[PDB]
Design a protein around this ligand. Structure first.
Ligand code: MTA
Ligand code: PWX
Lengths: 625, 299
């Protein structure tokens, strides 16, 4: 299925035109609310005293059709930024008239064009109209990939099209949008209707729109080639862009007349569906993650909070993660118990944070395929999950597993362990206080003990997503700091965003920690070479971990564990977006602070521009010890 | 042919004196247009006393005669239409209707030979047509905004002017590898009119109400109107007068030095087209969106 609409500037009969467009297979119609050539005077007589009606009546369609099938379009003659004062005033009154009439109809979306550099007064009228009530109407800004001046035919004898490649000049259309939405203060009711041309710009100009709230892609009938049968097709580069837009689930809009006379108007439509049936289906991770795209969530704290039943159920729904743990345990047992001691040496395993017992079974399965004897200790502090363990221990496990309902930092073990297995890692490696837990539990580990995981490392990467910045910006709460939402991380399936640099390691922890500098406080400085122009909104968070030797788990996209869908990237936002030029370096500084009660992250940008230090003294975000 | 659209868009005279009328329905339930012929100019705009009439599918943005029985139309549907009168001149049959522009065709003009024409549309595209073969000879994308007006050269069949909202006034010559030649910063041009007795001279009006006199071999101007200048038509006299139209609902007739000689405020809405009478040169007919067809006695 593809949600596709039809753009029109000529509608004789709404009842007839809407029926024909629907019979061709479209979902909605982009049409003008007033006649596009019907200019209207508002100041000077006698043209303003023109007798009505000014447009069609709302009775021509049902309220359901206006709410789902019709998309408003501004009149072309409306020029709010005209250098002529009279034309400017009439355009202001006309723009409000058409925007108010679109709202009167309850139109789901209204189209407004961005065709020049200066749209300041245009932005003011729209911002003025948005704050006149709290309605729910969308405003699609029609902005082309390439400006019309930069795609004109080189047929002007005394004004040739300059053939000197300018990097920033080819990105001028994005600058129009960036200035426009900034003037409107990042309104949630203002999206982009990207219009595609016959000649696509350089790849960096297209990448500029990554992370931008694109809700519509306009495809003229002129950009379609012709096959042998005489049907509309697209170039392999245009196809490459169509697939990129399908991942954003944008609505494609077909504009222009039928340039393939023989094949009727539905032919352009089937071709898009043809491309939409010819793309790789989702792969496990992609399938499970569908629905959570760019959905902000609070990072879990399995220490301070007791996880619910279904929370553990999601953890257990991943065989790849636990197959690695079973493999790591299976590998360590052989390296610690030689073959001649397979029947005499019994290893002491202590699952620190067993939950409902997925690692306990993984340990039992590991000792089986390794032909070694083990004595299990299932240590869990959540009393609700201990009910599942003790029920498991009575019906199936038995005397082999010893359930311990206590905190691993307070529990006094009867003996010392050969191996300790734990899954206390979050999306940012140590964000769940895994170092503090294992350090407190480090006393009852043998001098030659093995810690699984042995080490883990966090990874950061600067990202650009005007969409996600609005998501965080909309999370301001009543009885707290109005800017606290920017000083706390979020576990989110990153989707509509743009990674600005390859991720670099941030924080690393080793277990067992033998160092006399036992101190989990960290201060790291990272410098990211940026090879494009963009706006910085936040930093993506990932992590890698070493279970045992070569057995590893990772959410770092380059080294991501295949099939393991049970971890989403974390996001450290920033208060004000930062502009980054091509070639500049983004320098970020991250701190891992901690007191006797809480642990928290502090971060700040120092290049190219200094930001404010985020979450100082954990005022807006703390992890409970 | 019973209900005529209220917004009269164009009015043109031919040789014998018949009046061509093109209207559009710019509001209401149906948005379409119509073509009418009035062998009695005093009978217009009444439909009961007309010579012929036909209903079109969409509105009429701009039209012009193609000889003595041909009617070239620029429709909102993005198609260039050609209508021709029968042998008895009682019907108006459609000759062809080619949908080649991707947006409203805003302006159209017949070249000198009468066998080719140039069409300007809101799709930033200008096309050259072959009225005989009913095909588009060339398609130029020289401007960067909506094409406002295109005017063919009165005597050179390969030359024509064009103005767009990109503040560009282009002089065209299809005999050259690069046909477009920009002419010289002010407010946007909105109407073009060649001089009927000088090949290298034309006039243009801007959106601010200023008609200017331009010599091709690269300046006189005067503030004629208070709003956008809609049209500019030269009288058929030996020393032709200049009739200017505007959105201020006024008509002005200028001399050789752009001085105001006659002023008419008869129209209550926008004044769209103006045509001089070939039988009586001192008479000038104007139409507008107020559904009026006024005949002015120019002193
Ligand atoms: C199985 S997901 C992590 C598990 O470890 C448990 N856990 C976290 N911190 C501790 C701790 N200090 N002592 C014992 N269990 C813990 C959590 O309650 C959760 O069940
Ligand atoms: C084990 N575990 C912990 N501790 N935090 C998690 C977050 C997401 C998924 C999983 Cl499987 C998690």
């Amino acid at each position: 299925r593809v949600s596709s609409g039809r753009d029109l500037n000529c509608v004789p009969e709404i009842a007839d035109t809407l029926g024909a467009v629907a019979k061709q297979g479209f979902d909605f119609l982009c049409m003008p609310v007033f006649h596009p050539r019907f200019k209207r005077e508002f100041i000077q007589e006698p043209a303003k005293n023109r007798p009505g009606p000014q447009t069609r009546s709302d009775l021509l369609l049902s309220g359901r059709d206006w709410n789902t099938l019709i998309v408003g379009k501004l009149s072309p003659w409306i020029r709010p930024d005209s250098k002529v004062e009279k034309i400017r005033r009439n355009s202001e009154a006309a723009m409000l008239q058409e925007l108010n009439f679109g709202a009167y109809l309850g139109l789901p979306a209204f189209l407004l064009p961005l065709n020049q550099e200066d749209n300041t007064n245009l932005a003011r009228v729209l911002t003025n109209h948005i704050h006149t009530g709290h309605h729910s109407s969308m405003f699609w800004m029609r902005v082309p990939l390439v400006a019309p001046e930069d795609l004109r035919d080189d047929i002007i004898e005394n004004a040739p099209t300059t053939h000197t490649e300018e990097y920033s000049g080819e990105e001028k259309t994005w600058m129009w949008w960036h200035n426009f939405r900034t003037l409107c203060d990042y309104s949630k009711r203002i999206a982009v209707a990207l219009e595609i041309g016959a000649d696509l710009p350089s790849n960096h100009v297209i990448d500029r729109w990554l992370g931008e709230p694109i809700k519509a892609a306009i495809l003229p009938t002129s950009i379609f080639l012709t096959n042998k049968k005489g049907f509309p097709v697209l170039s392999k580069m245009h196809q490459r862009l169509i697939f990129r837009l399908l991942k954003l689930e944008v609505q494609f809009i077909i504009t222009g007349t039928n340039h393939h006379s023989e094949k009727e108007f539905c032919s352009y439509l089937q071709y898009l569906e043809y491309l939409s049936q010819n793309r790789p289906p989702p792969n496990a991770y992609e399938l499970f993650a569908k629905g959570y795209e760019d959905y902000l969530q609070s990072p879990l704290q399995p220490l301070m909070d007791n996880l619910e039943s279904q929370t553990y159920e999601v953890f257990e729904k991943d065989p790849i993660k636990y197959s690695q743990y079973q493999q790591a345990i299976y590998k360590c047992l052989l390296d610690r118990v030689p073959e001649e001691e397979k029947d005499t040496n019994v290893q002491v395993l202590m699952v620190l944070g067993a939950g409902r017992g997925p690692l306990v079974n993984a340990s039992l399965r590991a000792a089986k395929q390794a032909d070694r004897r083990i004595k299990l200790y299932a240590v869990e502090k959540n009393p609700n999950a201990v009910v599942t363990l003790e029920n498991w221990q009575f019906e199936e496990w038995g005397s082999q597993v010893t359930v311990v309902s206590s905190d691993m930092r307070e529990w006094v073990a009867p003996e010392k362990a050969d191996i300790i297995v734990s899954e206390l890692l979050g999306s940012f490696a140590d964000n769940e206080l895994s170092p503090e837990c294992l350090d407190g539990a480090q006393h009852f580990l043998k001098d030659d003990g093995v810690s699984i995981p042995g080490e883990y490392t966090s990874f950061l990467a600067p990202i650009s997503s005007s969409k996600l910045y609005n998501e965080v910006r909309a999370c301001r709460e009543k009885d707290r700091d109005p800017e606290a939402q920017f000083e706390m991380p979020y576990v989110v399936r990153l989707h509509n965003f743009h990674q600005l640099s390859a991720p670099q390691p941030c924080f690393t922890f080793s277990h067992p920690n033998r160092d006399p500098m036992i101190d989990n406080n960290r201060y790291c400085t990272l410098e990211f070479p940026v090879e494009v122009n963009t706006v910085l909104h936040g930093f993506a968070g990932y992590f890698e971990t070493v279970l045992y030797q070569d057995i590893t788990l990772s959410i770092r996209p380059e080294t991501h564990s295949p099939g393991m869908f049970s971890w989403f990237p974390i996001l450290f936002p920033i208060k004000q977006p930062i502009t980054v030029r091509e070639g500049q370096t983004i320098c970020v500084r991250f701190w891992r602070c901690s007191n006797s009660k809480k642990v928290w992250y502090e971060w700040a940008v120092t290049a190219p521009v200094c930001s404010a230090i985020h979450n100082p003294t954990g005022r807006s975000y703390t992890i409970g010890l | 042919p019973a209900c005529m659209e209220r917004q009269l868009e164009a009015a043109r005279y031919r040789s014998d004196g018949a009046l061509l009328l093109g209207a559009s329905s710019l509001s209401g339930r149906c948005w379409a247009g119509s073509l009418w012929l009035f062998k009695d100019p005093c009978a217009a705009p009444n439909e009961g006393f007309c010579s012929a009439g036909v209903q079109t599918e969409a509105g009429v943005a701009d039209l012009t005669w193609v000889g003595e029985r041909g009617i070239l139309v620029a429709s909102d549907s993005g198609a260039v239409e050609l209508w021709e009168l029968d042998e008895n001149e009682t019907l108006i049959v459609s000759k062809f209707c080619k949908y080649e522009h991707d947006d409203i065709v805003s302006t159209v003009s017949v070249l000198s030979s009468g066998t080719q024409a140039v069409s300007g549309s809101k799709d930033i595209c200008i096309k050259v047509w072959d009225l005989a073969q009913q095909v588009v000879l060339s398609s130029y994308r020289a401007h960067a905004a909506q094409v406002t007006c295109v005017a063919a050269s009165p005597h050179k069949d390969s030359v024509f002017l064009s103005c767009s909202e990109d503040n560009r006034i282009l002089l065209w010559d299809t005999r050259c590898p690069k046909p477009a030649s920009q002419i010289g910063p002010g407010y946007l041009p909105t109407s073009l009119a060649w001089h009927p007795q000088q090949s290298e001279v034309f006039v243009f009006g801007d959106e601010n109400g200023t008609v200017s006199l331009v010599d091709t071999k690269s300046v006189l101007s005067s503030a004629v109107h208070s709003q956008c200048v809609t049209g500019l038509v030269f009288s058929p006299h030996s020393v032709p007068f200049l009739a200017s139209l505007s959105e201020d609902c006024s008509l002005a007739v200028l001399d050789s030095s752009l001085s105001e000689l006659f002023r008419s405020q008869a129209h209550r809405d926008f004044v769209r087209d103006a045509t001089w009478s070939p039988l009586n040169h001192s008479l000038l007919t104007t139409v507008g969106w107020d559904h009026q067809v006024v005949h002015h006695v120019v002193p």
